Ligand binder design. Sequence first.
Ligand SMILES: Nc1ncnc2c1ncn2[C@@H]1O[C@H](COP(=O)(O)O)[C@@H](O)[C@H]1O
Ligand SMILES: Nc1ncnc2c1ncn2[C@@H]1O[C@H](COP(=O)(O)O)[C@@H](O)[C@H]1O
Ligand SMILES: [Mg+2]
Ligand SMILES: [Mg+2]
Lengths: 274, 274
Amino acid sequence: DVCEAAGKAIYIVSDGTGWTAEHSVNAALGQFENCLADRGCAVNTHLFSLIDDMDRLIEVIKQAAKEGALVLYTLADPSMAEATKKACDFWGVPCTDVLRPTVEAIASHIGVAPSGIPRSSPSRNGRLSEDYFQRIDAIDFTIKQDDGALPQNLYRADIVLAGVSRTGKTPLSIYLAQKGYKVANVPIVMGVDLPKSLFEINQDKVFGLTINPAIEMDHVRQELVHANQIFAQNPSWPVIAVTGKAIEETAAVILGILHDRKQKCSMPRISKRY
Amino acid sequence: DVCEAAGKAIYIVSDGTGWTAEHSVNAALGQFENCLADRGCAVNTHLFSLIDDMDRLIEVIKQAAKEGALVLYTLADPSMAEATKKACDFWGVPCTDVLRPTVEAIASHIGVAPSGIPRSSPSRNGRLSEDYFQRIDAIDFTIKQDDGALPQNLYRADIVLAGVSRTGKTPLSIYLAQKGYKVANVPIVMGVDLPKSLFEINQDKVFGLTINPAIEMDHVRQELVHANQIFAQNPSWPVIAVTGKAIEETAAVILGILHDRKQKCSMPRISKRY
Ligand SMILES: Nc1ncnc2c1ncn2[C@@H]1O[C@H](COP(=O)(O)O)[C@@H](O)[C@H]1O
Ligand SMILES: Nc1ncnc2c1ncn2[C@@H]1O[C@H](COP(=O)(O)O)[C@@H](O)[C@H]1O
Ligand SMILES: [Mg+2]
Ligand SMILES: [Mg+2]
């Protein structure tokens, strides 16, 4: 009577949350879209957060071996990394440290040795940045948002999404809010007037969103027509075709454009100070 | 008259969005918490999305060299990766491919060669998964949430956060919603009764959240006392101390516990089928 044979397995193992790795794995898996599409292959990801000591580490790998699984991992303490590869070797199981390469490149380039301490440990912790606390007020602003008090928000908002219902306004607005931006959504509906404040605010920062209907319900054709006229009336608004694109993709388009305008450069790019 | 000398620079460069890399960089930077704390060092991240051709690639590195900056990158096409390292060598600039290691480990372990095609290109695209469309309904459920229609939601919700105001309920609920979980928030206030449906729903899935006040306003002491009594009355609820912890940390705690119960195992872990 058990829960864990079926498919090729992958262990994601971190002394912290496991998310950085899960992200990298998620992206990596993209290279086998077509494999996974038709179940040509199939994968199981198993995520082990908070692996901050030796005993617990050794058990995971033991298990990984028992299950027959690749171990992708992230461990701040160098000894733990050594141990992981040694114990992977000893149990005869494939492995790979997904971000020491990245940690070390940064370490030489900055010219400082890594602390070797995870986020988990008692030292330096509770040290949440100003970047983080900004993203909270963004998140707050963006969800705490009725259409009753829209005008005022359009002035405050860093980004303004404008588009018909079936564009991804809510997820996207939330995604951008997490990145640090106060976002305001303005739906385009046949037969309701847009707030005049939409056009009085800074017109850089309004972004049109649109669906390609090519992917009865030709009312949607009607709406998309009406929408494009609004967008014509407003040439300076970028108009992003949104269907079959991930939020995170669209978000990058918007942010590239936003940052390119917000700071005019030789080479256009999204920049952050640390 | 220009925008881009000050601090050590880092270029994040992807044929797609740049996010996977930015994530890995963000995490990596953790190893130099104390360096960056006192401005012992200081860093600039520059994010270049959609670098899907040679000319544009070569310009970025040229710029990177001009700026004197490390290039961390993600490129599906092998030629582009070669080109990147060669041109980095030619301009004499440090670099490192942050996820081919991970792509290749997966490729041997699964026993299939990577497609070498980015998300950007015309082939296979618009192929958004069922995992993704689930996360949308989650996101929808979690924000589209008044306290008027709370009971009903507690039954539907996959996770239920219960805690006083100053716990991170809204950000966290949103973060979890993006991961796939319908979340319901229940605030604990002195002098308002909790919905009786809180106690009639599956009691695995309620998670208490609490602030350590150690980090006039001893009303907060009053609230935290009252809260803990509710939590005492309900022993099966985990009670996560939340202050000075990131959302993503807390989220992992909750999800570990959730998954551990949801599927009882020898080794506790968060699992996903692909
Ligand atoms: N602020 C931080 N301080 C120290 N290490 C960190 C920090 N943020 C992320 N990390 C490390 O980066 C890796 C990323 O994994 P995770 O945090 O689980 O997504 C782990 O080994 C963490 O310990
Ligand atoms: N579904 C996918 N198909 C192909 N490549 C992907 C997919 N998802 C992510 N990637 C690749 O993974 C890397 C991650 O970068 P990013 O997508 O910008 O965060 C890029 O080189 C992308 O092209
Ligand atoms: Mg991780
Ligand atoms: Mg990337």
